[PDB]
RNA sequence: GGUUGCGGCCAUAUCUACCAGAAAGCACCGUUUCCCGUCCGAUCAACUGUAGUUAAGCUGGUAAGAGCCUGACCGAGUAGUGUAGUGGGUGACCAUACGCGAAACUCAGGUGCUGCAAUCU
RNA sequence: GAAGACAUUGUCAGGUGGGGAGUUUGGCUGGGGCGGCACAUCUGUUAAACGAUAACGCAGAUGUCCUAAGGGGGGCUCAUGGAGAACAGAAAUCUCCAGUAGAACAAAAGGGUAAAAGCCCCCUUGAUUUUGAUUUUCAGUGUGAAUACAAACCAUGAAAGUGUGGCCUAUCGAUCCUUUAGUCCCUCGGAAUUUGAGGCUAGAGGUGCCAGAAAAGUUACCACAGGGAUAACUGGCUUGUGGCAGUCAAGCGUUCAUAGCGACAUUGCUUUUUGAUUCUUCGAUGUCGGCUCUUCCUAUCAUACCGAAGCAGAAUUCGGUAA
RNA sequence: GUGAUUUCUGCCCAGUGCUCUGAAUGUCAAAGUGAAGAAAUUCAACCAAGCGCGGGUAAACGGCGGGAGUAACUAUGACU
RNA sequence: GCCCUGAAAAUGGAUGGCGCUCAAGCGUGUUACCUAUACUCUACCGUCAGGGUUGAUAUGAUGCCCUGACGAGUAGGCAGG
RNA sequence: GUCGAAUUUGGGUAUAGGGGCGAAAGACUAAUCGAACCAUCUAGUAGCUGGUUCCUGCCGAAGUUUCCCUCAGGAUAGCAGAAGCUCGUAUCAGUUUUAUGAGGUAAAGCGAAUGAUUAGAGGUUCCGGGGUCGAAAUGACCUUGACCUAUUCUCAAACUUUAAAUAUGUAAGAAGUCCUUGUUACUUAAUUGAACGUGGACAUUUGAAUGAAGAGCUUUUAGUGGGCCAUUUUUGGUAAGCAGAACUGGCGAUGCGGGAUGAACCGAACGUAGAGUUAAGGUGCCGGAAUACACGCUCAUCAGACACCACAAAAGGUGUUAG
RNA sequence: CCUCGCAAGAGGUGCACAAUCGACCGAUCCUGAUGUCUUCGGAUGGAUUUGAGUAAGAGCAUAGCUGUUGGGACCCGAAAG
RNA sequence: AGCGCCGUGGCGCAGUGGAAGCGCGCAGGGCUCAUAACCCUGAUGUCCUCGGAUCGAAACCGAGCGGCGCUACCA
């Protein structure tokens, strides 16, 4: 058993999800997808890191565990739990096919689970503070060995995971038009209605600071 | 399948040439005599010596015969045939389905 | 070959007929026990229950042919063994229910 | 001994050495399939301007 | 195991278009075809009877025969080395006239209506369309629009 | 221009919440002998236009409304793609040359038009 | 002497009769066999946005069922959710509101359908007759299915209209033979009448290997024509599997990731494993093991020289140049 | 058929054969008999043997169980 | 970017070989030169097409002459020898 | 091994081919035996193998469709040749443009429907399971599950609002347009329309571009019906010089120059010669042609050296160079 | 081909042939006149029907290439019966 | 690996669309000095799991779990 990614790489087959057409295939061994303080605010972490891909490859659902058990592992040991957020950010949704006389009646059962990745696509998002920079760092580069191909970190000059550049959603958060939400924050639109939007942000229709 | 005893259909008869009354009954094929040119040829060949001279059929595949209606209009007493599909079950003036009534398990 | 497997129909079929026979005589003899002879009255329930479990090994045989085995021109006369059987199947069944019903049972006592 | 099902390699070669060239369509298509009704009146009209044209001509 | 049926492949074919539902026009009901008209054949699934093959959608052809319900309609098609010509019966639904039929009658009125005039005043007909010719001599005026230079931008990434 | 009858395109026409509606017209409304239909004159049928009411329907307007529609040099000439190379790269794939070219997004604007006839302060 | 019109014999008829005779013992196929039907068909996908398009490709279905589940007309709106009403509760019946279909339409699947193509009610038999034309499969042959008319006769509706079976896409069958219906027509040939028979027009009885032979095995006693179109050796491509080697480092090692190891991953090499394939060879390349003998490779067991150790010595382990 | 001597050759006739009976109140050819017909012919009844029914036969061909629980340690299972 | 480690197979061995190190290697650019049965021009052979020429003397009108284009070839077809 | 017998043997005699004879091996029956030998039927049949005899010229394929007890074969259509025939009189394009259609792939989308799926937030329980305050209460507090609302992360060959590029249908007129009035048993309430017409009008271009090498038509017949490779799209498989498709071009059927070598790659297709110029590829020598020029990089104690193509990766290196 | 015209072109006639609408003959399905052995005759007029037909004949015979079939069938070749 | 069968009370087994039983065990009473045997009674089930068709099943149709049996041949 257990058949290399190198013979399970590069993207040959049409997506094969799991459906009404294609039932009893194995559970994916990834089950937790966002890590560290998950509860925190993008008040709390700035800065973004990413680890990207360069190739247009299948990433293991093993290979995703594995990364992502290995990068807790040293963040948590460095600059312990509640000091980083990490979320990955490909779902492994692809069943792999395993053949096991001759070429008659070749078509193979479910195998695996896959994670088909493009070129220029996240793999590994972390939102942290502007101190953590090296220690992130250094455990994305732990997850780029577990993870097959060539792999990039690039420093997201985005607040937290979401959107709108540094200085942007410094003018919005001042402006007042950001609600701290669950992990997450709503916005200010100028479309909406009138008295739910007096009702749902009073910071922005007032004189406040 | 259900079909009545009774159906007003065409009549090709010439004192008659619109639709009319025809009792319905089921085509039963006929004695098959034994002085048909086709049997007394098969008489001759199969005297003799040589064994069975023609093919008899073995490999049945079917199950079902379409079922033919004999209807024979009531005025001219005509009769002319008609032909239903392959069904396994057949009645001639059956009880009618009922809609709606409780079912009786 | 469809030769073998109609051989097989066949010889199924003739120890069907005979079963049913050897039940019916079986069953008259029951009918007509003299009912004192209660020993005589168990001894043809077991007699008749083995014979109708031999008509259930054959009707089984009967449900596969049937279901599966490609009978392709008796699918008549294998219904009506099977019709058979299993009126038979009931005649046991009422005549078993009727001996095994306890006189003061609470099933008797509540409908005769 | 397996072999080869089905292939179009080299057809539309054959067929463009030998092109597809026309229907050779023609005035006065054949009136087959056009309805009977209005037929029989275009052979009755026909046959009526035909007799009028000559009465006129003498 | 292989099926090649009536209306086999013709899933999104016959599919109605997306709030387009329902029964279809008056206008399409109430459209007159007349012998020897060009037509464009595209299916309408909610009136099964009549439909065409799958092969006769988006086709053009001429009708020749008008029935009751009806146009029959004249396609070639390609089999083998030549073409055959086919005699389809549809329906009024998934019959529609030709628009750029329609624009060859407009383009035939005004042609008879310039060589009218043209031989009323003694010049120039030019009756036939001509392709795009090449562009010819201008002048571009700089007052008001001094040309801004520019340069490629260099390589951030936005991610 | 409002309204009614019949419509064409079938949301710029729909949906939600309020407000207004002179005149006429629709509408709600009043009644069960007859034709007729229902468990029920509620629907339908018939009769009256009388006893009344714009409350609803309908029409129109409002809403940083939802939806829908139009446009943008907004995204984006991006994704994708036809053709070409003894181009690059171990490969996966990626640039370049001649061409075509989106969708989502963003922003701005709009919220039925119209035909035949009749009628109306 | 016995037997006696019985045996015997002759001709027909029924039975028995592998003792013998003659013949047959499907096809596709990652070799054949076993398995399966991809053999006649239908749906979605493969299929690369006209059409066509393969594999023992994927997910399924067919050999039926229906006098209504066909045809016409009228009325109504479905699944579900919420709020209520004695017994009555999660679900019995009734009422209202919301409800673009989230229901139903015989079945597989895909389309289609809302004053309907759904549900209920009323009336019916057009699921009728005569042959033609056209579309799909296609050779533009047949079969099957379908379309639009024409000439009748009808059904329904106030009518416009609709109706030549099932809302659409599957649900099926030549010659010869038999049989039925019609014409009661033609012929039985020296001339008639009546039975009988043969014809003509339209159906049915069936070939599922579904363009349609009447059909069991075995050969280790075998034969012939051939085949590398096709297997069992080697060789060749590939390396799943086998074998070998890296990289990462959660941990083990008292303490300490890396003395020695090393999970979870991940990258390779090899052709000494077994497969996969079928390119060469079936007018033959002698086919297992052993003996015998030579050479080569290194991925080093020993020996030479070294480095490291949780190497005090001894013993041992890891590694290097080295065949 | 088995294969000197010695010692033994168990159970099964349901199946396949073989063999007995004889009218089962089955099937049953030709010839013959009766009826209808104008006749060819058709329909009846009768209908031998054999199949069928009913016995016997295995030194004829041949065949000759499965699952549970159960004894003062465990195991096993005389037993159920 | 290049180079190096990773990087181990069995006859002796192959950037084709010799050899090459500010290359005769790699990346790029500029010219010059070499060379095909390809292209241009000419001649000749054949085929095809279009055409001219019964006038007297001398011969063949299926003949003579002009113009242009073309020419690969298995299975196979036809033609002239 | 046996050697006094179930012994060995001579001669005579008997048994003959579906027969004999067999202490049984399918043994033997004149070197022949799982059915002898001889002659004839017989030149038996073969969809199978091999061979098939002079030259030159011109043209020049197919390995595909459908059916077949069809899969080593035929028929049929297709490709090809020959004979031509009717005209050279406005015809057609493996092409483009303009105009108008049609499509559901690539992409995109999921705070759009279906299906999958990550994470919190706010709520709702006369109505999930726990505990606490509780006697309980249409009581209260907290915990956890669901249901709703607004968000978020990632997806779909058999999901989709949207939606290309490339391919694809039609039209661009004389068989056309306009005016007037003739026919009809069709149609209309109706000289109303429909179809076909008569007689006039219309042109400079007769209604986009480009090219035509003649255009159209018929008959008959050969061979073929094993294919294979390359770019691109693509299915099964770990992959394959694997199997199976789509479009185009090639090999087969084809030499020549280059890739040292090679059926397919690059260039270019071929009568016999001469001259010139080039393609692809090259110019140290083999080897014709610059040990040319210019700017750099690399020193390898296994350098590297040119597409198909005859391989190398992850991970590293104060080696060096530039950022 | 004819007429006009210098020609361009205008008209007339137009064989073969091609397309189409008709007419006639046979079959099938109708309609059913004068009439009459009162059961025979089938006039007339039709029909999305059908024929391998008519519509101022083209065939017959011979020879040749090619092709088909049957014969040993281009030549050689079985195991068999 | 393929094909086929089976799965129901504590154990061994039946079971067809109106729907759960047999025998032995188990429980209560009786008889007996007592225990068996015998007599009179009673109770006993996720019908292997999950989903679907049906107005409804354990049964019909599909997915898996578990246990058996047959085949795996020519070299
Ligand atoms: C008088 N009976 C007893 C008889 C006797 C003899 N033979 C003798 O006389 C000699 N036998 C003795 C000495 C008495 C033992 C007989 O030989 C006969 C018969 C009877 C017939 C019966 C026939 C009859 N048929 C006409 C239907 C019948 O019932 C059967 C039958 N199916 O059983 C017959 O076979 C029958 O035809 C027949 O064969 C008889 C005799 O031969
Ligand atoms: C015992 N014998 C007397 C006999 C009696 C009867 N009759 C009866 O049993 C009648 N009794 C009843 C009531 C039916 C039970 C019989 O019926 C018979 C027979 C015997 C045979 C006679 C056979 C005989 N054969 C052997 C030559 C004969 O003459 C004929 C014949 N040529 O007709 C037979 O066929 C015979 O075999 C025969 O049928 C007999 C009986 O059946
Ligand atoms: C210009 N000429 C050479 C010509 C050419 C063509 N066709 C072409 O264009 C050539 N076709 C190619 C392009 C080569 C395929 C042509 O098609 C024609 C004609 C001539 C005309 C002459 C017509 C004329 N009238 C009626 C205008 C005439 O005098 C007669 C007559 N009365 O007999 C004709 O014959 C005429 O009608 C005619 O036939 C011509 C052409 O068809
Ligand atoms: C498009 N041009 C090339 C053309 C085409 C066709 N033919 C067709 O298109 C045929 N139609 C089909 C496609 C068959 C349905 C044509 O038939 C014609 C013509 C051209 C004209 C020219 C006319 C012109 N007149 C008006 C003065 C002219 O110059 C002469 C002449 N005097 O020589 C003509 O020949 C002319 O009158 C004419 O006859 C033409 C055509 O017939
Ligand atoms: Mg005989
Ligand atoms: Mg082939
Ligand atoms: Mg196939
Ligand atoms: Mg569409
Ligand atoms: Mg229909
Ligand atoms: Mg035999
Ligand atoms: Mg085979
Ligand atoms: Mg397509
Ligand atoms: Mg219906
Ligand atoms: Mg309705
Ligand atoms: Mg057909
Ligand atoms: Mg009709
Ligand atoms: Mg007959
Ligand atoms: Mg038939
Ligand atoms: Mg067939
Ligand atoms: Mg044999
Ligand atoms: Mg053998
Ligand atoms: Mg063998
Ligand atoms: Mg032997
Ligand atoms: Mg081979
Ligand atoms: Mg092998
Ligand atoms: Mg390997
Ligand atoms: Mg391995
Ligand atoms: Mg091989
Ligand atoms: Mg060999
Ligand atoms: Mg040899
Ligand atoms: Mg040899
Ligand atoms: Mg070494
Ligand atoms: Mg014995
Ligand atoms: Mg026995
Ligand atoms: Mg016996
Ligand atoms: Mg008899
Ligand atoms: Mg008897
Ligand atoms: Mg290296
Ligand atoms: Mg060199
Ligand atoms: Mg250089
Ligand atoms: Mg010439
Ligand atoms: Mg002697
Ligand atoms: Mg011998
Ligand atoms: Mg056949
Ligand atoms: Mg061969
Ligand atoms: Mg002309
Ligand atoms: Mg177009
Ligand atoms: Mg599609
Ligand atoms: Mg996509
Ligand atoms: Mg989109
Ligand atoms: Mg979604
Ligand atoms: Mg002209
Ligand atoms: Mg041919
Ligand atoms: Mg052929
Ligand atoms: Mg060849
Ligand atoms: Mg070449
Ligand atoms: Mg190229
Ligand atoms: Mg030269
Ligand atoms: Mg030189
Ligand atoms: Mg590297
Ligand atoms: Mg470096
Ligand atoms: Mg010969
Ligand atoms: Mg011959
Ligand atoms: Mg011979
Ligand atoms: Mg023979
Ligand atoms: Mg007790
Ligand atoms: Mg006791
Ligand atoms: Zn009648």
């Given at each position: 058993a257990r058949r290399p990614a190198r013979c399970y790489?590069?993207?040959?087959?049409?997506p094969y999800p799991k459906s009404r057409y294609n039932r009893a295939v194995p559970d994916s061994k990834?089950?937790?997808?966002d890590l560290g303080k998950?509860?925190?605010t993008v008040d709390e972490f700035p800065l973004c890191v990413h680890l990207v891909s360069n190739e247009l490859e299948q990433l293991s659902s093993e290979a995703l565990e594995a990364a992502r058990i290995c990068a807790n592992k040293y963040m948590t040991t460095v600059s312990?739990?509640?000091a980083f957020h990490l979320r990955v950010?490909?779902?492994?949704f692809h069943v792999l096919r395993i053949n096991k006389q001759?070429?008659?009646?070749?078509?193979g059962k479910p195998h695996g689970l896959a994670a088909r990745v493009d070129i220029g696509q996240i793999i590994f998002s972390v939102r942290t503070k502007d101190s953590n920079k090296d220690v992130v760092v250094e455990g994305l580069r732990r997850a780029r060995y577990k993870f097959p191909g060539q792999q990039k970190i690039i420093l997201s000059?985005?607040?937290?995971?979401?959107?709108?550049?540094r200085p942007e959603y410094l003018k919005k958060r001042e402006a007042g038009e950001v609600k701290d939400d669950g992990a997450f924050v709503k916005f200010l639109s100028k479309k909406g209605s009138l008295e739910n939007n007096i009702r749902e942000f009073p910071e922005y229709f007032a004189a406040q600071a | 399948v259900n079909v009545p005893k009774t159906r007003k259909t065409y009549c090709k008869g010439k004192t008659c040439r619109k639709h009319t009354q025809h009792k319905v009954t089921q085509y039963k094929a006929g004695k098959?005599?034994?002085?048909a040119q086709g049997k007394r040829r098969y008489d001759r060949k199969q005297s003799?010596?040589?064994?069975?001279?023609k093919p008899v059929f073995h490999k049945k595949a079917k199950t079902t015969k379409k079922v033919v209606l004999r209807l024979e209009?009531?005025?001219?007493?005509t009769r002319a045939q008609l032909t239903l599909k392959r069904c396994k079950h057949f009645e001639l003036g059956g009880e009618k389905k009922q809609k709606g009534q409780a079912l009786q398990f | 070959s469809q030769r073998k497997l109609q051989q097989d129909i066949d010889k199924l079929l003739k120890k069907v007929k005979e079963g049913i026979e050897d039940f019916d005589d079986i069953y008259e003899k029951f009918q007509s026990?003299?009912?004192?002879n209660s020993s005589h009255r168990e001894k043809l329930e077991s007699d008749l229950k083995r014979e109708i479990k031999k008509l259930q090994k054959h009707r089984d045989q009967i449900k596969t042919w049937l279901s599966?085995?490609?009978?392709?021109?008796?699918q008549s006369v294998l219904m009506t063994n099977r019709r058979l059987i299993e009126n038979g199947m009931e005649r046991f069944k009422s005549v078993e229910k009727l001996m095994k019903?306890?006189?003061?049972?609470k099933e008797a006592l509540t409908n005769p | 001994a397996k072999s080869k099902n089905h292939t179009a390699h080299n057809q539309t070669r054959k067929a463009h050495r030998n092109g597809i060239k026309k229907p050779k369509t023609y005035k006065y298509?054949?009136?087959?399939?056009?309805?009977?009704k209005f037929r029989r009146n275009h052979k009755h009209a026909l046959h009526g301007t035909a007799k009028a044209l000559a009465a006129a001509k003498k | 195991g292989k099926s090649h049926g009536?209306?086999?492949?013709?899933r999104y074919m016959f599919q109605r278009d997306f709030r387009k539902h329902g029964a279809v026009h008056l206008s399409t009901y109430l459209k007159v075809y007349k012998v020897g008209d060009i037509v464009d054949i595209k299916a309408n699934?909610?009136?099964?009877?009549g439909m065409p093959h799958?092969?006769?959608?988006?086709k053009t052809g001429v009708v020749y025969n008008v029935t009751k319900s009806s146009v029959g309609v004249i396609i070639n098609k390609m089999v083998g080395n030549r073409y055959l010509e086919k005699r389809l019966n549809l329906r009024v639904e998934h019959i529609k006239h030709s628009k750029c039929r329609q624009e060859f009658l407009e383009r035939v009125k005004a042609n008879a209506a310039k060589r009218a005039e043209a031989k009323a005043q003694g010049?120039?007909?030019?009756l036939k369309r001509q392709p795009a010719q090449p562009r010819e001599s201008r002048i571009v005026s700089t007052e008001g629009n001094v040309p801004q230079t520019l340069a490629p931008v260099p390589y951030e990434t936005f991610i």
């Open positions: 790489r590069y993207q040959k087959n049409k990834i089950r937790i997808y998950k509860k925190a312990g739990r509640d950010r490909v779902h492994p001759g070429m008659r009646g070749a078509w000059k985005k607040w937290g995971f979401t959107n709108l550049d | 098959a005599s034994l002085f003799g010596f040589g064994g069975q001279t209009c009531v005025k001219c007493k | 026990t003299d009912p004192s599966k085995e490609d009978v392709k021109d008796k019903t306890k006189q003061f049972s | 298509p054949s009136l087959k399939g056009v309805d009977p | 009536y209306r086999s492949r013709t699934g909610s009136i099964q009877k799958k092969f006769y959608q988006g010049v120039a007909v030019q």
